[PDB]
UniProtKB/Swiss-Prot annotation, chains A, D:
This is Myosin regulatory light chain 11. It comes from Gallus gallus (Chicken). GO terms for cellular component: cytoplasm; myosin complex. The N-terminus is blocked. N,N,N-trimethylalanine, found in other myosin light chains would not have been detected in the N-terminal tryptic peptide in PubMed:7358336 because it would remain trimethylated and ninhydrin negative after hydrolysis. It comes from the Eukaryota. The gene is MYL11. GO terms for molecular function: calcium ion binding. The chain holds residues 29 to 164 of 168 of the full protein. Ca(2+) binds at D17, N19, D21, D28. Keywords: Calcium, Metal-binding, Methylation, Motor protein, Muscle protein, Myosin, Phosphoprotein, Repeat. Changing F83L: Results in 50% reduction in actin filament velocity.
From Swiss-Prot, chain B:
Signal peptide: none annotated. The rodlike tail sequence is highly repetitive, showing cycles of a 28-residue repeat pattern composed of 4 heptapeptides, characteristic for alpha-helical coiled coils. Limited proteolysis of myosin heavy chain produces 1 light meromyosin (LMM) and 1 heavy meromyosin (HMM). HMM can be further cleaved into 2 globular subfragments (S1) and 1 rod-shaped subfragment (S2). This is Myosin heavy chain, skeletal muscle, adult. Residues 14-28 are annotated as: Actin-binding. Belongs to the TRAFAC class myosin-kinesin ATPase superfamily. Myosin family. The chain holds residues 747 to 844 of 1939 of the full protein. The lineage of its organism: Eukaryota, Metazoa, Chordata, Craniata, Vertebrata. It comes from Gallus gallus (Chicken). The modification Pros-methylhistidine is found at H10.
Curated annotation (Swiss-Prot), chains C, E:
One of its GO terms (molecular function) is calcium ion binding. Keywords: Motor protein, Muscle protein, Myosin, Repeat. One of its GO terms (cellular component) is contractile muscle fiber. Residues 7-38, 41-76, 80-115, 115-147 form the EF-hand domain. This is Myosin light chain 3, skeletal muscle isoform. The keyword Repeat applies. The N-terminus is blocked. Myosin is a hexamer of 2 heavy chains and 4 light chains. It comes from Gallus gallus. InterPro entries: CALM/Myosin/TropC-like, EF-hand-dom_pair, EF_hand_dom. Disulfide bonds: none annotated.
Length: 145, 98, 147, 145, 147
């Protein structure tokens, strides 16, 4: 965890903790979702978020919960560092079959089935290994941009 | 340029303006001996290369060691997270920030 | 002999991916090179077949066969003379300065004799050849013999 | 030491001295590292920083310790002054081989081996001597920007 | 003599790159020039060989040989007469004004006698020759004798 990433989680903690007392309760979760447009947010969704913690969601409990789910989270500059080492001549997005062979043949984390799941929402270019960069974006901030 | 390769007697031939000149069956014999002599010379020079070739692969494999992991773990996160309320929230919200 | 070098056995535990203390016959060529031995691939091939050992079918190994094969390859290290390596490349290009044009060394290392992949050829020229397209083989063969 | 550089070290001394009494003790070092995100900062790291001084870290002991480690520290404007004299026509980053030859052939501090270490984290452009300016940045403030 | 000039020993510590207080025989020519002596390179060469000293093989030095070689070169400073330097270049170009055409002095300084590199020739004309292509050697030889 770099310090600017921890400051981003402190700003997200303050936007969900609308009572500003330092502990995100279930009313803060529901009023942050209603301010984003969720008028139908069920109480069972709020209870499942609180069921991931053993205590009240203060800043260090929110940081330890996000730490334990993001144990391989990598910032965009280090993902582009590794992709610039895979394309060491610069500019070009690397081939689809080169990333499939190098993921498998180096590591067990690069096994195929997982490579079909990589191509599956990370579209073609991304999946193929040709573009580059959009995948670093969606690994640090999810969903389609 | 072609004759560059082969474990052949680089003697036995000779070039000129319209064509190459080549021995048989003596000069033919010569070359042959020669041919064997390069496998030696060659075969040995190949090896080191081969050897050496992979020796650089290890230096790369090794470097790579972690950059992968980084990549490895890093992805996994996301696959887990991207479905998490809190994380989607942070997501829609991440922009309003400065 | 031990000089009993027990670090050859510790390096066999770094190349065996299953942890059972056996190394397949296809890895023995590259692990002899990683222990400080450069047998040519035809030599590694011959010896194998010589001993009615087929590298075409599944193979396992034991340390008790890999140790004497490394000791049979260790006598052939007297073939590694650097005079003949630099004189080979000095006969490969004109003028009194040690420079191969880029693509001459890359196509010769991939297609002449024991085929080296063009991926390995690019990894062996990376850094020693600059953008002039001229590989100085005095420093190139020096750095190749540094590993 | 120019006076604005000494005021920058006075501001860094006040941010690490969170008790505001004028002497940075080991608790100030640990609480400044914990406020930057270092939750695992060992006591042996704090003891190695205090082992570089002969007494308590007040402002003049911190200035003399930084003076004795930065005996060739040069501000960015004087490094760009010297690089504008090396490129006297302006704008262009100077060649890789020109900086290697001029470092060696003028001085013993510009010997090669050291030139391979200059290229080694100061990347290509920087190392090569083509770009310019990013090296002045990282000599006044380290690490990748 | 000391006048014991101990700054010659302090300048030997600025030219020895190893710090062991020895200066190789190939540096002795340029360091005699940096101490205020202009022996020609053939003279530096002869003296060396004269003393069965080979500048072809590795060399070291000691201050105890470099001091008397600088004192043997110091008698030859009576050959540095500026009348003959300005009259040499005055016979090298027509008319009553001291100007050499640019390329005449550059090609003569690189190829006639003791070969000066064209890099050093450009560094000695830089500033004294303007864009008219005419080197005024009255001020040019004045500035060359200012160092």
């Amino acid at each position: 965890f770099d310090e600017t990433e921890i400051e981003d989680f402190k700003e997200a903690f303050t936007v969900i903790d609308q009572n500003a007392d330092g502990i995100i309760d279930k009313d803060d979760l529901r009023e942050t979702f209603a301010a984003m447009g969720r008028l139908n947010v069920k109480n069972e969704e709020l209870d499942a978020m609180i069921k991931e913690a053993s205590g009240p969601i203060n800043f260090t409990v929110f940081l330890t919960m996000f730490g334990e789910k993001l144990k391989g989270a990598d910032p965009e500059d280090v993902i582009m560092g590794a992709f610039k080492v895979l394309d060491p001549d610069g500019k070009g997005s690397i081939k689809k079959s080169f990333l499939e062979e190098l993921l498998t043949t180096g590591g067990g984390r690069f096994t195929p089935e997982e490579i079909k799941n990589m191509w599956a929402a990370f579209p073609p270019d991304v999946a193929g290994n040709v573009d580059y960069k959009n995948i670093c974006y969606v690994i640090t901030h999810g969903e389609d941009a | 340029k072609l004759l560059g390769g082969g474990d052949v007697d680089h003697t036995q031939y000779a070039f000129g303006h319209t064509k190459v000149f080549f021995k048989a069956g003596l000069l033919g014999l010569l070359e042959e001996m020669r041919d064997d002599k390069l496998a030696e010379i060659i075969t040995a020079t190949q090896a080191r290369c081969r050897g050496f070739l992979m020796r650089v692969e290890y230096r790369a494999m090794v470097e790579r060691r972690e950059s992968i992991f980084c990549i490895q773990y890093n992805v996994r996160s996301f696959m887990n997270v991207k479905h998490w309320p809190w994380m989607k929230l942070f997501f829609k919200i991440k922009p309003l920030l400065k | 002999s031990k000089a009993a070098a027990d670090d050859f056995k510790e390096a066999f535990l770094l190349f065996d991916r299953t942890g059972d203390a056996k190394i397949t016959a296809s890895q023995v060529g590259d692990i002899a090179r990683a222990l400080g031995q450069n047998p040519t691939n035809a030599e590694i091939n011959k010896i194998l077949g010589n001993p009615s050992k087929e590298e075409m079918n599944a193979a396992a190994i034991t340390f008790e066969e890999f140790l004497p094969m490394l000791q049979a390859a260790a006598n052939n290290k007297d073939q590694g003379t650097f005079e003949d390596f630099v004189e080979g490349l000095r006969v490969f290009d004109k003028e009194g300065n040690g420079t191969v044009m880029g693509a001459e060394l890359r196509h010769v290392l991939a297609t002449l004799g024991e085929k080296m992949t063009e991926e390995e050829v690019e990894e062996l020229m990376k850094g020693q050849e600059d953008s002039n397209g001229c590989i100085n083989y005095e420093a190139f063969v020096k750095h190749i013999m540094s590993v």
